[PDB]
Write a protein that binds this ligand. Structure first.
Ligand code: NA
Length: 163
DNA sequence: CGCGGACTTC
């Protein structure tokens, strides 16, 4: 776990929620993410101030996390648009810019296995509980990421070299 | 026309 623990050192952790599975699959295919405006600004600021920003993905009502990734850029505007599957009532403009992300683990973790972890930055609720963009305290986020199964096909060299 | 937008078994 040496490489993973190096990637997680002094990181800030944010829960990411998706209304659908398709956009998380697209994010896994293309290494990008978009979020709503308040979260977009929060993530840009965190990227500029923190050693690493870790996004922990969870599809709404799925009962699981779907993986985690490290932000490798601030959100970009004006480029070729990502063709997200738009939830009902959401527009393409609402998703704003596009972050580049490097996946660290693309395996699932069921909520049953994280039930012992509570988040002191969210009223000490189980870490599975949170809106999109909910920040997770350092120790809680680190232990949560360490619970995921190894992703045998990910090469962490690119992440580590960027850092 | 900009208009407010991706929690958890309640
Ligand atoms: Na997938």
């Amino acid at each position: 776990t040496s490489k993973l623990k190096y990637v997680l050192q002094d990181a800030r952790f944010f829960l990411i929620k998706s209304n659908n599975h398709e956009n998380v699959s697209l994010a896994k295919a293309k290494g990008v993410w978009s979020t709503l405006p308040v979260n977009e600004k929060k993530l840009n600021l965190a990227f500029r101030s923190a050693r690493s920003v870790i996004l922990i993905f969870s599809v709404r009502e799925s009962g699981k996390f779907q993986g985690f990734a490290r932000l490798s850029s601030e959100s970009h505007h004006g480029g070729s648009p990502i063709h997200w599957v738009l939830p009902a009532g959401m527009s393409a403009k609402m998703l704003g810019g596009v972050f580049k992300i490097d996946w660290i683990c693309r395996r699932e973790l069921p909520f049953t296995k994280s039930a012992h972890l509570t988040n002191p930055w969210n009223e000490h609720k189980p870490v599975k509980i949170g809106r999109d963009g909910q920040e997770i305290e350092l120790e809680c986020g680190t232990q949560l990421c360490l619970l995921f199964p190894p992703d045998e096909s990910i090469d962490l060299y690119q992440v580590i070299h960027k850092m």
